[PDB]
Amino acid sequence: DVQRTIEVSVGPIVGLDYTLLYDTLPETVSDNITLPDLKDPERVTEDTKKLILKGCVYIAYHHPLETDTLFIKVHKHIPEFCHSFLSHLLDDNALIDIGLFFNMLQPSLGGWITKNFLRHPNRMSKDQIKMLLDQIIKMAKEEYEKVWKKMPTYFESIIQPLLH
């Protein structure tokens, strides 16, 4: 029975417990996917990728104490898990154009978003970080070369302060 649990809990992201992830995601997400979907972004539709990513942002916002086993086995690995799903949805030389991305955000977050916040996401509040990550998922489908090509890692850098 040890092998039965290894089979289900272990997947592509090292250290992530896929059974605890499936259990922790909101039912609005888990009503629409299975645990094997979490292990294989390529077999998931674009819209279901976005639904999983939005769920990850939600449980990152509502994370448990960082000493809990659940945090170590799930939340600690959400940045890498989101990087994977984002890469599939959408290079060590390319950069992230903060100035273009700031303009892209004006219709949705222009009332409060600042260049400072985009350079230093750990300076945002938890509510702001959540709003930025949710907005990135909403927009995801020139700008590709400058912003979207680097977004999987930039998104990873934004959600990490949400976890603490």
Of the candidates 98, 106, 113, 108, the one whose C-alpha atom is nearest the C-alpha of residue 143 is 98
C-alpha–C-alpha distance, residues 140 and 46, integer Å: 10
Resolution in A: 1.8
Q: Domain coordinates of the chain in residue numbers?
A: 2-90+93-162
Cα gap 36→41, rounded to integer Å: 9
What type of residue is 159?
I
Where does 39-77 have alpha helices with state H? Answer: 46-61, 69-73
Q: Is 21:38 a contact under the CB 8 Å cutoff?
A: yes
- Return the residues preceding each gap in the chain, C–N over 2.5 A, or none: 90, 141
Q: Is 164 helix (H, G, I), strand (E, B) or coil?
A: coil
Beta strands in the chain (DSSP E): none
- Three-class DSSP category at 136: helix
